[PDB]
Every structure is written in structure tokens, then in C-alpha cells.
Write a protein that binds this ligand. Sequence first.
Ligand SMILES: Cn1nnc2ccc(NC(=O)c3nccn3Cc3ccccc3)cc21
Length: 127
Amino acid sequence: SMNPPPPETSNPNKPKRQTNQLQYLLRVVLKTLWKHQFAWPFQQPVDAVKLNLPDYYKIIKTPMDMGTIKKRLENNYYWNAQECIQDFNTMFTNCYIYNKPGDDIVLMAEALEKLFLQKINELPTEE
Ligand SMILES: Cn1nnc2ccc(NC(=O)c3nccn3Cc3ccccc3)cc21
């Protein structure tokens, strides 16, 4: 059970736009989550080989992490803020699916998710 390649982060064949909502997701949301005390395990794809989790990618077919989301924002991969919000939600849900409730990694994800939801509530309206 080798690791898969990381998610795609740059596609020159997709149309691009710079918007106040996408800028907020990078400059505020990704920034504030990245610096959270529990952010480290979520800053790069799950290395299931190094962590000796041979079933991780048998269970999780839509992996996602904040390093990927940072790159997607930087490369104008998303047309809409909702596409980026979905990637964050996928990251949290993957953790909740793979692990037992109350596991340390789940409590950490839950704390990151709480901060995420607060920042998404303050998502500015489209300019
Ligand atoms: C199993 N699991 N389920 N979702 C997960 C999402 C991310 C990680 N990351 C890590 O374990 C990790 N990243 C960098 C270092 N570590 C070691 C470590 C082991 C245990 C707890 C914290 C950190 C595991 C996940």
C-alpha cells in the first residue's frame, strides 16, 4: 500500500479569477489554520507508509490536506470559494471516517474545524 501522488494543485487549462473571497481564504483562513497549535498533522498529505497505516488509502479515496489547499489557492485552482470550503471539509471528514471518535487526531481536527467554521462565518460577500 504505497502512498498515492498528492492531489492536483495547478491546472493551466482551468480558467482563473482573483476574487475577494478567494483572497480571504488564503490570506485569512489558510493563514490562521496553518498557525493553529494542532495544524502540523494536516499541513501535508497523510504519509501512510511512514505512519504504518497500510489501509489508509483503502478507506480514504479523496485525501486532502492544507498544504494542497494552500497550493490550490496560490495557483488559482478554484473558481469559487465553495470549492475551497469543500476541500477543508473533506480534510476534516476524512479524519472522522478513518479514526475512532475521541482519538487524539480527531480531537485535534475538531479544534481546527471549530476555528475554520468561525472564519467561514466571517467570509466577506462577493465584491
Ligand atoms: C491517522 N490519521 N488520520 N488522519 C490523519 C491526519 C494526519 C495524520 N498525521 C500524522 O499522524 C502526522 N503528521 C505528521 C506527524 N504525524 C505523526 C503523528 C502521529 C500521531 C498524532 C499526531 C501526529 C494522521 C492521520
